[PDB]
Subunit: 597 residues, 3 copies
């Protein structure tokens, strides 16, 4: 019976087709052409083969898994998750992903085109979950790889608004696993309390994984949530570009970071962030060094836009019993960043760059060097005392700042009587512009507060662009901070009225290989001789000065002080001025003091 065959599930396999009636084309059956595509509807059926409508009382998980399993068996393809429907997930998956609280297991070469919505059912309320998992084993070390898996479309993953049940729980959207050529593009992740939205790689295993043109909206909502990083990049040659991240929770302002860059050759570009505590960590964790080595290098954070409450970029490296992690060859450029409206001390200490201790608080394990911070803007509102261009809280082996515009409370800061970092190769070029928003707010404060164990091979070229007479000093070194083989300068513009410009509480500017210059007021007295006549300082704290020159006009007719000075062994300054008429002269002059510059 022909009628019977046609009405049967093999019917389309009996109806002939030839593309556009082209006599040169293949003589196919309708089913062949329909078989070129596949959707969730092709697996979303009961045991008799009748289609099941999705909805809040239907658990779509087993059907989607069957679709992925079947396409995987044919070498791959793309499964569409249809538009105009919400597909709910309502149970855990089984096997290898159960160890990861997994819902769906991803498979190699099987792409998901999510055009409709995927939504978690209340079964998951107060429970852990990882929605899509690419590991195939509960132990990631024993997992196979996931390759050539792409998730893309105009659709949505909705985490149902459910809070965490316990802080120790973990929640994720996509864990690609040991992931090679995998990506998420176009998707909106929203409405949750999760740990991560996407994680790429596993402990350095993976390559060429990307997140592009995704949105992440309101993914922390509770005090229970221990920590949140929206994308964790844990394989090399991988990155995040052109994404949107937004949070509205108060809790997110204290715990949430947009991106973790944790392996070499990784990037974070062209993205916009609002409502987060932190922008990006750039870190080499020794505990994550298995797949790609012990070094994080070629790290790029560029051309992002951010409103955060804590720190924009945080650098780190640490050690384990048998591995040491190193961070080097980093670039941070083109970013425009602000600390959002908040009270002082109400969120983690505001910073553009933070050199942070390790997760246990250790500040003597880091090996961070060859970092370039250039062509960025940073702003914090004037009330935010806790705002810095760099908070330098752990050992630093080098960081270079060129041509940034920093408009916040401090330039360089570390809290006194906390950690005592060892600092090498800190370079603050004169082309860094220091803004004026916090003028008049700096009573008792040092603009560059050098609260370190030691500083070597460092450059700080201070250039103000407006007055701030509230500040205690432009730069201060406590006596506990050794300083050697360094260049510290304070340009005189906007400093004439400052009582202190640079302060060396241990007289460290006297060091043999310290090169400094800064303004000071000096009292001088002359001899009485008519004609060329010496002037000498009354104080004797200039034994370190190599030359000094006048920054003051001479209101006198009958004499002039020296234009330039040198020193004497007793620590006086001395120079030769001119008495048109004789007499002992006394003057108080603003000088530029110079040492070896």
């Amino acid at each position: 019976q022909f009628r019977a065959i046609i009405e049967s599930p093999e019917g389309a396999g009996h109806v002939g087709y030839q593309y556009r009636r082209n006599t040169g084309s293949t003589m196919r059956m309708v089913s062949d052409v329909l078989d070129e595509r596949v959707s969730l509807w092709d697996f979303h059926c009961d045991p008799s083969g009748n289609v099941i409508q999705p909805g809040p009382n239907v658990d779509s998980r087993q059907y989607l898994q069957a679709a992925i399993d079947y396409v995987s068996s044919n070498g791959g393809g793309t499964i569409t998750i249809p538009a105009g429907y919400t597909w709910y997930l309502g149970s855990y998956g089984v096997g290898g992903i159960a160890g990861h609280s997994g819902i769906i297991q991803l498979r190699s070469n099987v792409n998901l085109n999510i055009e409709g919505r995927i939504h978690l059912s209340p079964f998951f309320d107060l429970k852990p979950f990882q929605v899509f998992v690419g590991f195939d084993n509960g132990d990631p070390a024993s997992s196979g790889n996931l390759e050539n898996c792409h998730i893309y479309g105009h659709g949505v993953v909705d985490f149902g608004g459910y809070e965490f049940g316990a802080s120790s729980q973990l929640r994720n959207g996509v864990a690609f696993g040991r992931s090679y050529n995998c990506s998420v593009t176009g998707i909106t992740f929203q409405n949750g309390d999760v740990t991560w939205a996407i994680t790429l790689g596993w402990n350095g295993y993976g390559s060429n994984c990307y997140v592009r043109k995704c949105r992440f909206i309101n993914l922390v909502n509770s005090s229970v949530n221990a920590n949140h990083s929206t994308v964790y990049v844990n394989c090399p040659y991988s990155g995040v570009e052109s994404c949107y991240f937004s949070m509205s929770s108060s809790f997110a302002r204290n715990i949430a970071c947009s991106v973790q860059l944790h392996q070499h050759d990784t990037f974070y570009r062209g993205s916009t962030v609002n409502g987060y505590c932190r922008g990006a960590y750039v870190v080499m964790h020794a505990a994550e060094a298995a797949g790609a080595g012990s070094y994080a290098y070629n790290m790029q954070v560029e051309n992002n836009i951010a409103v955060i409450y804590g720190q924009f970029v945080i650098l780190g490296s640490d050690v384990t019993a048998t591995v040491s992690g190193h961070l080097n060859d980093v670039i941070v450029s083109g970013n425009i960043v602000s600390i959002g409206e908040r009270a002082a001390f109400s969120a983690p200490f505001g910073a553009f760059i933070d050199i942070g201790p390790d997760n246990s608080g250790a500040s003597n394990v880091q090996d961070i060097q060859r970092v370039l911070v250039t062509g960025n803007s940073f702003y914090a509102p004037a009330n935010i005392t806790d705002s810095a261009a760099i908070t330098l809280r752990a050992n630093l082996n080098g960081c270079t700042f060129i041509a940034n515009n920093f408009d916040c409370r401090y330039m360089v800061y570390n809290a006194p009587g906390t950690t005592s970092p060892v600092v090498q190769n800190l370079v603050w070029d004169k082309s860094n512009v220091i803004g004026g928003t916090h003028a008049n707010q700096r009573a008792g404060q040092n603009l560059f507060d050098m609260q370190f164990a030691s500083v070597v091979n460092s450059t700080i070229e201070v250039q103000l662009s407006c007055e701030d007479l509230s500040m205690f000093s432009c730069i201060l070194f406590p006596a506990s901070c050794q300083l050697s083989y360094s260049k510290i300068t304070v340009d005189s513009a906007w400093t004439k009225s400052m009582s202190n410009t640079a302060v060396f509480e241990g007289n460290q500017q006297a060091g043999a290989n310290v090169y400094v210059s800064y303004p000071a007021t000096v009292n001088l007295t002359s001899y009485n001789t008519q004609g060329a006549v010496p002037f000498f300082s009354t104080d004797t704290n200039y034994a370190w000065v190599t030359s000094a020159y006048s920054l003051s006009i001479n209101e006198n007719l009958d004499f002039s002080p020296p234009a330039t000075y040198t020193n004497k062994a007793n620590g006086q300054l001395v120079g030769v001025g001119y008495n048109e008429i004789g007499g002992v002269r006394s003057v108080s002059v603003r000088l530029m003091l110079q040492r070896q510059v």
Copy 2:
């Protein structure tokens, strides 16, 4: 009758199908699978249901609208506009979009995949039109939102070449309206005389709207066209990336801009522009402040390539009777820009940055601050007198330039006897490289022409990199410009032969908190004493000088002038030189004059 059913429109609904003969798959009908996609052909039919071929004598509008209306009713989806066909539009739409001269009404969740061509018929010649409109009401204030609407593909929107009929008319390609998560990707807009190609948002209402990888080609063609901006970004968290803009009309060189960034958290990146008057406006219009506040902040213009005839980036902010607009936290970086080949004064005044008055010409309403211009190149051909790094034509509350390369006629310019802007926090770092293309062209001109009412808290560090002895001065302040709490320096390199370096026509460099240095030639005479001997200037216009030092060699054996000088109350310079043999000496020396630096 089985034959009858099969031949009927329900026939495919009787032919069974099961994906790849998989026994676990859904037992569907052919029509179910065909129903997973939708195209214009599914609505492009006569009242009897017979398909109609598109073409220049068929108006496809009602069919496309029916398709959008129907898909909208099912929760959304993607309508394909087929490749290999041109689909003409030949009438106005009806209802809510009639108030916007709308052709097609877009609807939420309904995407258009434009693979073929859409082409306007001559019905639209000399008339207004907006091809795709997302408003649902003639009054945008009473409109609902458009959400999740994406237009993408390899296809083309062709505006038929028709000129405007009257200057007051408006024409647009896509007006998304009060638009949330909407985008245009891949599409070519060409061949028209329009006001805009795409507009995003409405008066700050909207979010997450983007234009990516689109082309805009020849969209102004007539003298009637009043004004053209290719993409208008009027909602936050939105932007333009990786687009191509080109014009060939002469009129475009005087009226056309590529992008308007008019709300916070907006960007313009990675794009190429040719043939336009202007690159981008970055503006907060008080009249547009309803949806997202009164501040435009986090504005980003980065890594674009442009050949324009007028100004690359134009900044603005203005007020209404009850709202004041503010612009702050802007970054302009990585752009390479030139003024195209043209006669001087033949297009609007060439500039990299323009600080422009409001639309009525007011220059005393702006609140523009915290702008960073860094790491850009600008070039204008040597004949273009009207070319500047910045034309500063309205009040400015701050702008910072670091590490740019500007190769044009002026660095800082405003026309004398026009507006008198009040300038604060203008910072021109010494790392800005001033090119040499216009050397020898600058007779009668000041490189930095400070034609302002006042300048405060500003820095100008001039550094030449080649000679230009044609210029009247490196920097000039008219007597009408107050100057205070500022730093103005002229490096001596390539200046030895200049008669004027810095010029203060009101002697403003004498101010208590002005910090300056610049070269000058000075005549000095000594006393006759053998030995250490004073030299004094013949002129008395140095009462403001704090120190000066020699920039000239000493061709004498029998004496030497002072290496360094200070001043005296009568305005003479004085220093101590050395007469090996006695005698009154007279010399003319090049000095670096310094005040408080």
Copy 3:
């Protein structure tokens, strides 16, 4: 017979369909809907119309060509190359592409969606080939254009691992030809020994061609391969963005470049490179000037990540008998680059920028100017003697460096007794940070080794950030290098112990329009007079010095040397110090020598 028609190839054309049972929709046949898409299966059939399975023993070429030819005839469309299959190509194409060793001929408006794999069969071993060719004629000058051709998908082009048979052979993946609005997106090119993977345009003919989000993996594998450039951009308004390039061969480290930018308005952005000799050439070849003029301008290399073995960006321009090529208006910004681990001299000389001779070795043909290198990082390991910020090997008409961080052996280098370039407008701003990795390695070497015929209108502002007492000098000019109208400065920080700072082997710092400053040690003797007393240098090689000042402390009580000095006609320095008590004094002081600064 109805049964007969239904089973025939016209069967689907008799089965009715109406979208979603919508009474307003078109009353179509199943075949109409199936005809909206097209795949390789629709042409991959034998002469009787039976489908043929692809595989290593089937040559899919004729079937894919038939598909492209047919779709082209209907106005275009998109052919899918199905996922889950490998499609082998095993013969050359015929006609116009035979002259290009072409396999498949691309056609206008016909896109390829490559979801599966395309793989070359061993027929191609040791032979030339170009897999996809858009020329339609063996002579490219007589070719028609290719327009609106896009290749995209998650699929793969695999070149079969075959080595080149002869060095003179050429191999390519995609040659778009005289190409307008063409692109490759998402595709992986791998496993070959080829000349290029993609070429865009032909000798300036073409426009709006792009390569985005592609991977290029292991595309050189033999010593026979003469030269490799992964993407060659030979039309304007075209570029490469967000790509991944990797090589593992030793040969690639000596021959392979990622990108060629060879026409105006072209870009290379956001890409990652590993294992290559070179990053990008930016060149105007006169021989390629036919389609778009003789000038390459608006050239952009930005925000790339690279590990290379030779040079990152190489600039060039050259001439033919009748055309002269010019390069100008270039920007290189935001790049983070390193020379990978290698022995010194084991690959082409390491550099960030190279100013290279033409292909015959000529260094006197170039017209390269208006280049900005800003905000980049460069690192080479300490053992790599052959590493430079710029190797300046051919005539240079201008290049500007601002705010970079260069950490390698040399800053400026050219080999002595090779070429003698004529240098104009070389600008090295003081904001360039010179790293310390190569400290102690520089015995016998000059950090800036100015091995040129002449230098004019140039600026070199040297600023160290750590000591390197191994170096012979910071900057050296041989006597053969003329120097005029230039500024050369050496900041004193970290230089106190250097015997030579700046060296002018021809005494070129004496030039009338040379502006210099650098530290030196000077021996001085005083007269015996008590009181103000002159000090004079013992040596007479300071006739060029305009002023000098002390960089040393004064360990004496009874006298002080001058703080500042000028010169005398005999070449002595002279200044006025102070003898508290009389006596002839002798001192050796570190001075900052200054000329016209």
